[PDB]
Amino acid sequence: TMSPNELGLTSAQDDGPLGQEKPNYFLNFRSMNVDIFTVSHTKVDNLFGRAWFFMEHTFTNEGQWRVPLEFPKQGHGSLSLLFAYFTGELNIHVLFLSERGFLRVAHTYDTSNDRVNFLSSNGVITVPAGEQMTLSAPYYSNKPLRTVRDNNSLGYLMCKPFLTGTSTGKIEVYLSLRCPNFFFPLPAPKVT
Amino acid sequence: TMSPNELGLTSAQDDGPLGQEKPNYFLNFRSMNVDIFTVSHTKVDNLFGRAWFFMEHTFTNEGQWRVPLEFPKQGHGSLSLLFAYFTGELNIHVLFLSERGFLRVAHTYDTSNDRVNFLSSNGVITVPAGEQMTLSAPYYSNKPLRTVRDNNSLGYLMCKPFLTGTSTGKIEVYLSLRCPNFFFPLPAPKVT
Amino acid sequence: VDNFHSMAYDITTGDKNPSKLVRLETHEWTPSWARGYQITHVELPKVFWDHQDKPAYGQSRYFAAVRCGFHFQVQVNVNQGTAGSALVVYEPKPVV
Amino acid sequence: MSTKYKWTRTKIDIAEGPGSMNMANVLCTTGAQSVALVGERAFYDPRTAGSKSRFDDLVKIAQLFSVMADSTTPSENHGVDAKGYFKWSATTAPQSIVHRNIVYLRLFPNLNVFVNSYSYFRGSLVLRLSVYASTFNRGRLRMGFFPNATTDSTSTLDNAIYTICDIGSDNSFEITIPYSFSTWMRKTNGHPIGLFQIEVLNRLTYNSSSPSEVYCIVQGKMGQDARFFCPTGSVVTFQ
Amino acid sequence: MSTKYKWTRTKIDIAEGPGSMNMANVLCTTGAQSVALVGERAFYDPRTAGSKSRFDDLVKIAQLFSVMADSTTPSENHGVDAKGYFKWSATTAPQSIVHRNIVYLRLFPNLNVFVNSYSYFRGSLVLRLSVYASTFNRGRLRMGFFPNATTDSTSTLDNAIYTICDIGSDNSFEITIPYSFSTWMRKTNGHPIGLFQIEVLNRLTYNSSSPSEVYCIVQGKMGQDARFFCPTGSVVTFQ
């Protein structure tokens, strides 16, 4: 039968270990699970499998653009802030807004600035002007885990455009991840 | 044999329940079914599976465009007005008429305006300038059924364009639905 | 349970009482009225709690949500000499 | 081993109009991409609608009766108009007309919708005349129909598809028109369905306490063999 | 042999919006190209995180208690505010209120995150009141909850979902609210969850060496049947 513990009478100091799926009942109540869709939208793989805006850059010349990639404190991706460590594939969505040219894109977790001077070794997929690509950067991280908060939690992204004439433009960036491994959930964030 | 009831002699007050496929005959007449095509054009899935114009928007800048989506009182889609409730997939056809840029598109049934500020979480498929896409929005409705008439019977559509230069244009919209679930047919509409 | 049944009623009488059949409305059709004129109407479902004298009025007070089915019986009596016809129809919120 | 040929990605030719969007074929739209989080489907709830299943075919709606050219007031021209709401009188003589008009699908609320949706159709049409008299009133009324007729003029119905109505307990009378046209399918909004006439056969009798004239209603619906075919543009705008 | 037809590369029609990038469906993103040297996968190391496996479902986090409208100082308005940190007093009379406020998911740190992520949800909510008194203090306190209520006013809880708390060794009391809404799923950040009231049933008793008033904490979490559905935009920015 039902114990008084499952009826509401408990002790907060007896909750450890963390993660106790204890059932709560009353005479007219029972945990009822109802699913409205064929799958879950709470699973890390599904939720995060959907991109979210990151930032935009306007380029008037080929100069290279390197930006630290970090988890959002803004979109649905904020749900990541509930975790401390991450590891796994990283989907980067880049849009090249230009009239005539090409955009070199590359990703590295390496903090050294110089390693990115010769962009070709790193990757540098090519998005023709007016096209958008989605490259999935692997976990080539020199650190087993990525503190999820760091201003560079995610590796740096490189964008250099091979323009042809006076043409200029702007590069919008969106980020998403493939199968994410989060660990050791930390306390919920505050609001600004 | 044939009863006088099936020969025309009946009583209007004995029609309930609704939906009586009673056969009507005469000496030289019998219900003859002849099909001219390999399939039906009366089935809800087929008829509505074909789009119809909705509305057009001209944009001179990136400002976002949100428009309530509703059933037509104009095209063949008007046949929906014969029903009261709807539920199912929604096919949205968008044409981006622009010289150089990108068009963010997203759909939500959520009435709150703010939820749409950060468009990325919602969806935001990308149609490059001069391209047209057909996105099928699922029934992410907080209401089990959508009164078919409401000025927002269908969820709201969001369009924000990431233009690059002074370029401007117009976005034409067409709507269609995938497998529609209509219920409780109501009286026929009037004319203007 | 009173084994003598000093109250000869089904034990679940009080429970089912609120589902009991009740008079929701009455109106006098006026002969002059044109076709398509609305004779009378009843707010559904709040009409079953129309007055504090409605069997369902009691419980209806202690709950904010409701999910129910109806069984209407519109009655109209007229001598044989007279004739006419009325349209009794249910109109969901969408129609209304 | 196939190492005499360098390995390569498959090469394919792209047909004309790549990127063209087909908004005519359902087989095309249903295959469109999904903005769903996981390109998933939801569980529909018919119960909230009081139904056990969704509505799959529209033809069934076209098979639902609707008053013809319904009006607030009865025909003020002895029924010679399109109003399917006319009066039958003690005054009208036998062979006198109580109603006459050319019938079109658009004259019916339900059907008029399909008329503004589909371009063609086929099948039989059923009209049901409901005379509302008292239990004392008696008489007969013959309603005929000349399929495909256009001359709106009273004419003997001896050769037309008619139905004689003898007042009793079931005072609703039906008349079926089987599909009649040169073409296999016919314009939804084209040539008339035919001439509809309801002539008096036997004067409506009455007594001291019964009405000398009664009201009549004409409804119309599609037969069990009804079909609609091509969807076309709209000729009117609903509200 | 098929030598009556010249050999040809396959021809295919390209659907609308080729090159369009779908950033909504996961099934789309996971299939994106790989910039990996050999489009390879790495071996993850959970141990360094002290875990034996990664975290797969987020709902479990929504099922973790968090203080409601937590503050540094206890409710200075006799608990009539949103602060889930109030004081119970020897002074307060029975039926007097120690706390009252309208509850929203955003009032909880953990939940507020999901509120800013998902658009809808469903399931029961659990609130746990923890009164920290000494082993000598005794008394009762009834906390009720009117689901979906909006009028923030003290009212008899005899008809509300309540839980009577008798001080003892386990001074943490729970109360479950089963999902209650017209809709199957409900706005994450919409209509209130209901009216939460904690009234005094029996004055907190004490003695010469025990406190005349104690501190209380109210936590909130989702039930085992909790679910979230559509991810929506953000209504606030975290730090």
Added chain:
RNA sequence: GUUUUU
């Protein structure tokens, strides 16, 4: 690592 999907 069914950690694309069954």
Added chain:
RNA sequence: GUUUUU
């Protein structure tokens, strides 16, 4: 030449 991949 498993020297595309297993």
Added chain:
RNA sequence: GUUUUU
């Protein structure tokens, strides 16, 4: 006409 390839 293994005359795309084996």
Added chain:
RNA sequence: GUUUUU
């Protein structure tokens, strides 16, 4: 839900 199609 054969609720893409058979």
